[PDB]
Design an enzyme around this catalytic site. Sequence first.
Site, mmCIF file in Angstrom:
data_model
loop_
_atom_site.group_PDB
_atom_site.id
_atom_site.type_symbol
_atom_site.label_atom_id
_atom_site.label_comp_id
_atom_site.label_asym_id
_atom_site.label_seq_id
_atom_site.Cartn_x
_atom_site.Cartn_y
_atom_site.Cartn_z
ATOM 1 N N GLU A 1 18.713 33.902 28.663
ATOM 2 C CA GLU A 1 18.200 34.405 29.923
ATOM 3 C C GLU A 1 18.019 35.910 29.972
ATOM 4 O OE1 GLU A 1 20.062 32.706 33.607
ATOM 5 O OE2 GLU A 1 18.487 31.123 33.410
ATOM 6 N N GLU B 1 53.370 54.839 49.097
ATOM 7 C CA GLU B 1 53.578 54.950 50.533
ATOM 8 C C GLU B 1 53.174 56.302 51.134
ATOM 9 O OE1 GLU B 1 57.865 53.933 50.409
ATOM 10 O OE2 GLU B 1 57.425 51.969 51.199
#
Lengths: 485, 492, 74
Positions: free
Chosen positions: B64, B305
């Site tokens: 393809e 954090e």
Amino acid sequence: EHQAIAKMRTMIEGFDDISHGGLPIGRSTLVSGTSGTGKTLFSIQFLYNGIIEFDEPGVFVTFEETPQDIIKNARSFGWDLAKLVDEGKLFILDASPDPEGQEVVGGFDLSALIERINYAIQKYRARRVSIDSVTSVFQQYDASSVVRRELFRLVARLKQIGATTVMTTERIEEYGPIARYGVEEFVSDNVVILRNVLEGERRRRTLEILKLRGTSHMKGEYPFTITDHGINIFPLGAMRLTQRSSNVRVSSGVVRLDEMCGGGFFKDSIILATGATGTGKTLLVSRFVENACANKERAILFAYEESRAQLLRNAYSWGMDFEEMERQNLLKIVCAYPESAGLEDHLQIIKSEINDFKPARIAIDSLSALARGVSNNAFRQFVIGVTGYAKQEEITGLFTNTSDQFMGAHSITDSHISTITDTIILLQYVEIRGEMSRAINVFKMRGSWHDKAIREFMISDKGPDIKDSFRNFERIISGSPTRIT
Amino acid sequence: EHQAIAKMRTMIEGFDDISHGGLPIGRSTLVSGTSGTGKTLFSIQFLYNGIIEFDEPGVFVTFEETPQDIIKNARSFGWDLAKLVDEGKLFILDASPDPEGQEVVGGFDLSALIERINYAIQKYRARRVSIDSVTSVFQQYDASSVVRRELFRLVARLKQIGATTVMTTERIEEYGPIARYGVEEFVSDNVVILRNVLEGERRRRTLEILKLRGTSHMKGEYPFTITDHGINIFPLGAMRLTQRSSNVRVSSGVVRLDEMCGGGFFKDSIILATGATGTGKTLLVSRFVENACANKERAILFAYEESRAQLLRNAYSWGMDFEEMERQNLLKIVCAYPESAGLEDHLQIIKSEINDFKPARIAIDSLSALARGVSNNAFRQFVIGVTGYAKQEEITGLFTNTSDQFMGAHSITDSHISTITDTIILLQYVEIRGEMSRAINVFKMRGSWHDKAIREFMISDKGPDIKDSFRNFERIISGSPTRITVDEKSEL
Amino acid sequence: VFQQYDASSVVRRELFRLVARLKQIGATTVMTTERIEEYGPIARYGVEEFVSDNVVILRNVLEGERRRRTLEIL
Ligand SMILES: Nc1ncnc2c1ncn2[C@@H]1O[C@H](COP(=O)(O)OP(=O)(O)OP(=O)(O)O)[C@@H](O)[C@H]1O
Ligand SMILES: Nc1ncnc2c1ncn2[C@@H]1O[C@H](COP(=O)(O)OP(=O)(O)OP(=O)(O)O)[C@@H](O)[C@H]1O
Ligand SMILES: Nc1ncnc2c1ncn2[C@@H]1O[C@H](COP(=O)(O)OP(=O)(O)OP(=O)(O)O)[C@@H](O)[C@H]1O
Ligand SMILES: Nc1ncnc2c1ncn2[C@@H]1O[C@H](COP(=O)(O)OP(=O)(O)OP(=O)(O)O)[C@@H](O)[C@H]1O
Ligand SMILES: [Mg+2]
Ligand SMILES: [Mg+2]
């Protein structure tokens, strides 16, 4: 004949127990599974074992794999089929198609093939027949009803010929229909399903005898493993409650503990050490593994939480030289991450090594680490397995459990193994004056007396020193006692 | 041959371990998965490493994509196929259809294509073959049985040629049939499945070797990542429990702690600091990272954090200048939200940076945060990975965990990592006289003695000061104590 | 367009033809497709997924009577 359907042994480990003797003689058993379940291996092992244990010749009909390939593949298991073919004990009948090409040679299909299998059977005086992937044959362009008829025809002719046959099918859904056309299920006398179940990124192979017309068999799924020796099944529900039980004692490696246990652990026994993280389970294990060498006995320490090197650093820092035990060929360390296997696999590795080393003691450091991920039911099954094996083999086993919560733990085990066990040693933290002290307690012992005190203890280079109980305290089990004056 | 099948190494990171050596030589391996799972890349990398590492030529067949596009897309990984084409090491045979048009192209197809392939193989002395999406070929108008035969034909011919092949197929369901026709799974000797599983709104790529006829291999799914270096697989279950272990000590950056730990942390060891929010885990980290610079060693601080700025403001207020550590090239900060990736990604980013910076120390401020969302088992797997890497690499690792409940926490970790760790430092709040004070305890230490005291401690600009235990208290651990002793001093 | 009377293979060829010509022309294109299931096949014929260079999925998930739209580059 006038009697109880006779069975041919497969000699495939564990299968004859499940099938209560083997495959029914003279009938054919359908064995279906999805890709890579071991259909082909089953069917080859059935023939190979036939030849090598009973000198029963075999005929292997292949529709897709090439005979060279079948031969090549068997080398995986250290099987020389080319030799067997040469000695005339095995005959692989190539029914695969021409890589090259034609489309008008098999207009005599089923009929013709059935003649070549009958010719081969007579020729080699075959007793066992394995047809590999019958499914692929009508995967030419057929509908359910056409398949039902062809299959029936075949099964039947082989029945007439008198051959015990293994027919192999493919499935696409692990728990969906039994075989591709939802028709083979009902045409065979016996059905065996091989599953490779996924579940959590792990794969678990199970074998199931779904039905055996005329006899009994164990029901449900049994785990198995494909190894260098081929298919190996553990019928964990087929293990009997008939283990030998003595009164002999053995040391824990800690004298005071021995005292508290009323003179030591029983040789025939499963001892459990539970405690919050860091309480000292691993120190006990070390000590229990060391006591077997000082008495020149073999011990295996299966470690699932620490490296072989770390185990050695920490052990040496507690006295005990693991290095020597190793050389002296008295102690063997294993080590593996629970994640590096399925419980089935682990179980077997364990058995395996126990067989190659014949230990007297065995310590599994952290069953609780083996329970990581797995289902409780899958896990309990594992414990009964290792436990039961050690029990029937007269091996003394020390297993470890880390409780999920330090202090205040309200149950001995979070997985509830405590009943599967004979002796339970229990370690806990106790908050005494702004400090974290430890306490050891022989919680229960099955055939002895054992001390009921919760003694405080220290850890030094010398090891575990068990001192006295906290007589003048209340709620010691809470972890936070209340010194009453 | 009287031998069990031999494998060809793919050199694709992680794959040869999962496949116990590589792909079976002379056979073909079916690699299938949904759209965007990495099929095409696996196949290119297989040929590429073939050429660059063993000088084994490769033929890549494409049905393809265009040879120009296959070459163009490979630049994404730093691969010059155009060069290899040139030096006759790689040959892309274009089997795609022309954007114009012809009918009845099913017959000659296979056959012609097969000698086209044979021709190319023979011509370039190819050892490796990749056929990209055979699927798309009978996606002309076919039914399962026609597919089964054609496949069989092809595999067979290639086997005869003696080529080691990788064949690619598409799927439409992540856990549905192996390949489109529900037939390819059986015709192939080897089957590999690439998955790109959704779950949450994150995607996790996994690779599974379903079966390899003839040999063994690891079972199940293994997470992998596509990177600038292609496919990278982590066989977290293949990591061995053989890490080196020394008796060497190192400082925590807090002397008093060092004493409590019987003379500092072990160099070889995983440290875990736990406690409710605000107890000071981050302070301990900062201090632990600084200590490695003051000793001119490299350290990485992976923060999940706080921002890189915030970390710097807070640090400076505790003394320690993170600025300098940076310049001096001893300290490296990272920072990233847990959500900006999947655990697999994170784990790799961590490993990657450990390789470019070769740290002596590492700290991950908040595992607890990386646990946000993810399942417990996915998480535990992550921890064993970072933990074990650290361990086999002789890097001292400090990990942080914020407990879900301040005071009263009944377990060290909510995720139950406490067994995967060597030393455990516990921080807790203690309500003493209407006030919230802190306490620090060395809960456990694998090779040493450590202090069993639950010492109170304060935090100032100087940093952490560890004072004395709460001797005259009962229920310290509970967070809300009780004072004792009912005899002050009177007469005889 | 092929929702006129077609089967998967016919669709794969036609799509491919179009995409291909477009690439020749040098155009950057956006092609739209319908799906019936929010988490099932990518597009109708279960063939467009592999014929395009890039795939984007727009979802409008139900879940509890509220609707949440998400975009994914697959
Ligand atoms: N020596 C070995 N050790 C461990 N596992 C092995 C070994 N050899 C083969 N295997 C495993 O056994 C499997 C072989 O399965 P097998 O060839 O028996 O047939 P099948 O799965 O039933 O059917 P199919 O023909 O569709 O592949 C391999 O997928 C692989 O996992
Ligand atoms: N040399 C030593 N001197 C004094 N105490 C030690 C020494 N080594 C270890 N310890 C103590 O023993 C504990 C180690 O526990 P151990 O290794 O026995 O395993 P565990 O508690 O059973 O399991 P796990 O470590 O997985 O939690 C430490 O918390 C520490 O207090
Ligand atoms: N350098 C890169 N870094 C990270 N990811 C990349 C990079 N290059 C490509 N990718 C990712 O890899 C994918 C490429 O997949 P690939 O081309 O290998 O084949 P496929 O999905 O198997 O099959 P097909 O797209 O032909 O249907 C892209 O979708 C993208 O997500
Ligand atoms: N300069 C300072 N002087 C006195 N106390 C400080 C100072 N800086 C921070 N603190 C105290 O330390 C705490 C900060 O906690 P820390 O940064 O150590 O991380 P943590 O508790 O581990 O995690 P998290 O902040 O995410 O909850 C504050 O709650 C505060 O009481
Ligand atoms: Mg331990
Ligand atoms: Mg913080």
